[PDB]
Design a protein around this ligand. Sequence first.
Ligand SMILES: [Ca+2]
Ligand SMILES: [Ca+2]
Ligand SMILES: [Ca+2]
Ligand SMILES: [Ca+2]
Length: 536
Amino acid sequence: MQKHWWHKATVYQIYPKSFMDTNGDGIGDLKGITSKLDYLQKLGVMAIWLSPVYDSPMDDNGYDIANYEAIADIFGNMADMDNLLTQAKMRGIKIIMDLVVNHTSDEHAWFIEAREHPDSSERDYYIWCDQPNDLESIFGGSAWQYDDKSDQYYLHFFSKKQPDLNWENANLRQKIYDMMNFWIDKGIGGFRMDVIDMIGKIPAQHIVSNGPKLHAYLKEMNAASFGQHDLLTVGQTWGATPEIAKQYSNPVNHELSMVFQFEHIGLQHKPEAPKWDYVKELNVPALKTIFNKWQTELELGQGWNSLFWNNHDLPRVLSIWGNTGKYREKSAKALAILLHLMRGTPYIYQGEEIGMTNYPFKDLNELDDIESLNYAKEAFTNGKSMETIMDSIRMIGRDNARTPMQWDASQNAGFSTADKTWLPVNPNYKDINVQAALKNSNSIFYTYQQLIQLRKENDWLVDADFELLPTADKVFAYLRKVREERYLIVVNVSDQEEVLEIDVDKQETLISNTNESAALANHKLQPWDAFCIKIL
Ligand SMILES: [Ca+2]
Ligand SMILES: [Ca+2]
Ligand SMILES: [Ca+2]
Ligand SMILES: [Ca+2]
């Protein structure tokens, strides 16, 4: 397998509204990010996945873009973006921009012209229909919005203010590529592609994800933009299987570097049940099956895995799968160790490295996310009390991932000087903040730092295979093997003491959140015990 820079990289996701505010409007901005670049360099990440900072009415907080080549006023201006690029560059960090091209804002020039002049070219940049089908929006209701003026429905798989782009239109695709090249020329490190597996959609045939033209489109995109360069491209692919992932990430296909798959995320809810009907306890054997499948199927020189627990769309991993009480730190370290020592590119969401958690939202009025609010509006009329709804949202709502980054124990956790922040700061900031984590030599932060440096400095994290070991249900254990080198990873994914009936010759300890020697000797694991040891 040909090696690229990003094979040694760890990616850090920044949610711009919630990272750092430098002008007291209670909203994060570019200058804040740039101001915290040294912190990010100390962590050791090689790239920043920056969630959208483009011009946007913020109805889906950036993922409804009105101008792909302008910065939203709330984040600053283009000068701030350039400065972010240059400073990050100076600190050895690349910027990965969020590419959102399945849809635009309804306030994009293209759609405004599409409505103004129905005979214009950009009218066909979108998907118009006289006779709509039963396709639903992801945010509830019909995926077809009737337009009084032109008397046609336009397609939107998300919000009504996010009309879908017509990817059957080659001119539209071309303008997308022009824009992508605009950003490539500015010196970005790559693209994260929002719901990219949807661009092959054929709504008339009820085809949404994994459409027949999808990979042709991705090949065309590659050829027309980032292909010649040496960038990291990661696609968000809800409907991805390991085979489809092979199609995406095998370099000979000339498409993407890797994709985000969500099979493990599916364990956060019951099969075929809405995500709001959340699962209470992590099914560790199920996770074993899923992770093992993705590790073994995506062989080397055949595809590349992405590794993540959580993002701006998901609950923080501690709240849904970890421990938020007595074993918060230890469980956080355990999950970090478990994920990062597999093969692939790991992604750290902001605050994950200090063990931030979900927020205890009290009512709908505190919420911002359109998905949660729409869900609430529908659920309240279909037999669910507001408290039930708020419970589900408290566990699964996207706003849980979007509370302000917790930097210290000062006002608003040092995120802002404003009286109020756009989302409330979690009260646990007095115990859970960056300053305290940096001060604590054995904090979650330094576990993440160690993992990152391990990946940066050791080829076996890339080269070695994966073998799942037969263990107790809640014990996640595997071997990474390369040449004669054997690396054992053991993680007790539970609040309970578990048995460890293996006998090995420990050569050395690479990382551990506990007494690995005592665990091996007594053949038992304390709750959330996690270590990696090189064995004979
Ligand atoms: Ca601000
Ligand atoms: Ca009319
Ligand atoms: Ca103030
Ligand atoms: Ca210290």
